[model samples]
Target: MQRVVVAIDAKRVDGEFMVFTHSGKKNTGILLRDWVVEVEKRGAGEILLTSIDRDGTKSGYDTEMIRFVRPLTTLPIIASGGAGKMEHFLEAFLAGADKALAASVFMRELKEYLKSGQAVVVAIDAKRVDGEFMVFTHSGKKNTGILLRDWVVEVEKRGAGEILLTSIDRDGTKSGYDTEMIRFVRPLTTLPIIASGGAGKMEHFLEAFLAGADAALAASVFH
Candidate 1:
């Protein structure tokens, strides 16, 4: 956790198994002594940066945290947590986060990949005009005035097979999956749920599956 790494109040660092930006986890404080040196002796991987203040707050990513760690290490970095808008993703990258992470907020344009017996994905490009998941028809050139949540249920009920749910908010950031959305979706249906976008690393895939996703797709970690 970026915030936790710098200042911990309620959480602690493990420097081994995980840490928390607000007790976040995966990596923040492990090493027992110093995490910077711990991460320095890496074999292959980037630091998973995060912020405790914005951990579960859905405010925005801790850009300052990424900047703070930039001068400390010379490896790849992934910014995790506190992302609220599309601009925030860019902000994290500008602040030195190789990738950013988050879910919902701006993740209106969603999609679904199903095996209609032929391995295909149905793209659902939606937008939250006023706190609603609005799905689109006619190639996403027009709105169906339908709620995304309801439509997802319908997609399953209608036997459309499966879909890829990407959060516009967590799209490009490396913070991780917008777990909130994944949690929201995990219990919705038994259909194969693909965690698309914002996959900064294989760890994201772990978080994706743990969040109830059948697959984790990467649109950001193309590196």
Candidate 2:
């Protein structure tokens, strides 16, 4: 069978690369360089290398990491992370990346560099509180006391292009997505909804989509 492995690099900590785990919430002790060689030795054809540091930041790809890994392996490297605009993709190619991946460019961007016409995707971490969905902040720790429905409408009026709605209650549960929440919020606004949290299997994503989510987000499920 053909083999390919996704190597998620969390960061260059203390001059060594650490692998990401728990949806990039933590890092493992494994050295990225060693892991790549092991995977290649095990007959992996290509490496999907992602930098958790630059992922979702939309600033730029980790060209430094790409350059460092290029000479280490003969495998084709699919550079992942960042990619805010067209130039960033070109930069990744110049940095010796055979291919590039992008995740959050359309979800977030600087207004000053609004060449793409304000591609702002408002991210909300929601929790069921007092029989209503309330927004949370600080990594789902601080309750914002704002109703999610109200916030979604407010954001759309304020020029947000999309909504990335995550369920704090369902996050990491591996049960399924909060389809109920998606159904409740879908009619609240016209902005496209990206359902996040608690995706265990392929059916879970289908459930979210059927519940009115335009897209779905998962981590450990895919990892």
Candidate 3:
């Protein structure tokens, strides 16, 4: 495909793209927008935005933050983090979200992001190492130490519409898809999964389908 979507969070600081750890402590790293910018420059179809401070509080979305991101990019944005009621969804939408009610909108945004036959999805760059499935950033070079299975579940709960899963080890070699990986994530959530990282032949497409991938992305096939 020609584009991808990214999942991101930032500290709870008052800064523009504040980010925090799962523990709600530590500076974490740079602004979330900085990463957002990088992703867009590199063919980002859309962005999945979530907040750490208001999560589970049911207070509402960080509309201020959502509004702040309006000028950041032209791509669609999926807002997440907090929602105890319908109003929360409305507010997030008003604040610049392409859509809202993070937990419930999984199916809604799925179709919206599927624009022009493009996949505005969750690009998961992951691999199994030392018996653990870990998620990575920057084409799997920078390991964030997050588990693949855990992130998949969270991606559904927190606000991602679709998943574009890539197997770092299997990409390009086209050993067919990491069907084992597909099977591992298929049951986690009902969100659509577009399998990447393998596609040596036509049979690979069929393999990914039976393995539970909602879609398959083979660069050579389309590229």
Candidate 4:
């Protein structure tokens, strides 16, 4: 990955590249700071620092993590995880996160941000179980209690910038994306929707685009 970064820099390839450091039991903010510095030195464009401790809690983001890294570097920072309401999103931005990624409040807070003209992105984790569509958060532990089509319409009405849709069932399974879900929600909104999770093959990328996703986001494939 370092060599790839070097090559990109060598070619002057300017684009958005984000590095996310998961704050699991073993990794803390201090360790993240060190890693951020190292990645920046290697030519990473931006870094998204997320706290696994707050993952799926729906309480809010870890403000202290943002504060600790604010002065360390000038790179853009995206705060991820633990967002449950409009206030949480507002607070994350107020605390200096250039962007925020959330899962739990796709139908509620994301709509609020769009109405308020605040730039925000909705990270949706969806799955299809026995032909019924479902949405989950906090790595599939929590139910959002909303349907994907209705949620998309609500967020679109509020004027959202983008939607990041991830298929939980296909995540880490190496199967293809759940195209039916994407197709079902595509007509509901004009906002750019990003297809996330389940990118096991190049054909899967084409499938997502053909299915109505504007962009494709993957975790293990890129890693």
In model 2, what are the clashing residue pairs, if there are any?
Answer: none
Task: Please list the C-alpha lDDT of all candidates, in the order they appear.
Answer: 0.53, 0.71, 0.68, 0.62
lDDT of 4 at 157: 71
Superposed by TM-score, candidate 3 places the C-alpha of residue 204 at a distance from the truth, in angstroms, of 12
Better of 1 and 3 by TM-score: 3
lDDT of 2 by residue, 1-223 (tens): 1122344555788888777776566766777777678767765555667887887787888999888888889876767778777667668877887656545311233333445312344567889999999988866888888998888777777655657788998988999989889998999988767677888887887788888887676555434
Give the winner by lDDT: 1 or 3.
3
| Order of the predicted models by TM-score, top scorer first | 4, 2, 3, 1
How many residue pairs of model 2 clash at the backbone?
0
**Candidate 2 residue spans exceeding 4 A from truth:** 1-9, 13-18, 23-118
What's each prediction's clash count?
37, 0, 6, 0
| Candidates sorted by lDDT, best first | 2, 3, 4, 1
- Backbone clash tally for model 1? 37
> Which ranges of candidate 3 are over 4 A from the true structure?
1-3, 20-26, 104-223
Q: What global local distance difference test value does model 3 have?
A: 0.68
Instruction: Point out the higher-scoring one by TM-score: 1 or 4.
Output: 4
